[PDB]
Ligand binder design. Sequence first.
Ligand code: CL
Lengths: 213, 215
Amino acid sequence: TLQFQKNPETAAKMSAYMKHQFVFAGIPAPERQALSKQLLKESHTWPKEKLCQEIEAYYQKTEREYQYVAIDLALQNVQRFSLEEVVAFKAYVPQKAWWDSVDAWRKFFGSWVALHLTELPTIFALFYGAENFWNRRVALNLQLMLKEKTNQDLLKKAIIYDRTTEEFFIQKAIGWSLRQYSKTNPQWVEELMKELVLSPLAQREGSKYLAKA
Amino acid sequence: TLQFQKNPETAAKMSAYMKHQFVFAGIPAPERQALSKQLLKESHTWPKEKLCQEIEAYYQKTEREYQYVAIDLALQNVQRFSLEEVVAFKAYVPQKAWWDSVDAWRKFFGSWVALHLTELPTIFALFYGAENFWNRRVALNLQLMLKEKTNQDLLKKAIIYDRTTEEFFIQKAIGWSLRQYSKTNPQWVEELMKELVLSPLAQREGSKYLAKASE
Ligand SMILES: [Cl-]
């Protein structure tokens, strides 16, 4: 495997930023991309089994950027995965979980769905009602980039399921999903917030792009 | 396996345009692209061996649009090929060759090289000085889309090699290589064209974007 040298100073600041949930090598995203560029390039040519093994191998390394590399390996190869391989990735979402890895997994699941729109409800269903809130954050935010292809019923159903959930990262996810969708359909978003009793946090977060909050 | 519906009237026209040497189904490119979209999408998911076998099976089908399908399969999966796999695709360039398939193959090799720029000399050398002029057409046009990433020496070497070659498809390829590169480096193109005595066709084609003294 690729090996990051430690930038101890930057590493401590990134850790503090991530509320000390993880140790870092201390490597900003653009720099990580430059260091892992040859690896990501080579990854497109690997047999599927080799690719899955390498994603597992990087994910299990201790420093945080190695989870980012593993998730980039999946994202850069998102077109190569079948439905059944994508379903197997769900196993990683709860692993080493914080908003940073989970949102990266969500971008992976979201990108694959945007490639395979007919499986939107299948992937949504994988995460909907999950025991683990990080899994439900994926269901809530699966459609962030779908714009006019957002499935409103599914979005609404996820928000309703988590309406009064106390978890900070869940209320944030509801808010994010609404503000994103409001760039496409401000009326449906504004009306939903009037018809449901949302947390103050979701409501504030959900109304960022509206003319009147 | 994608199957095109035969459109006899459109096929006659497409066939005539390639001088009646291929059988056509009669599926123009925009329609072909819409009809093969889902096959191209699922092709990314195929094991490498299946992908090579499918490319080969489409290439060996009768109608010309299936060769276009084959090259699209390769083009869409360009990132998936190692150097060794790309070298093996050179075997297709002289097969069922005419400007339509060879220029589509050239696009494949140019895209792969755009993705793996350190291998430009290696891919160029596959085609440079080949016996089959269709292969040398690829050498001449490998860099059409490379702009500032173009390797001048290799371009110049290829033009020198075929400078006096009679073949229309070669002189045309020389002119195009100069035309495209002049959008990036008109001085270098100017210098070369004054250094070498190029065919009237190559000279007309390559000097399109150079300023004239009479204004
Ligand atoms: Cl990133």
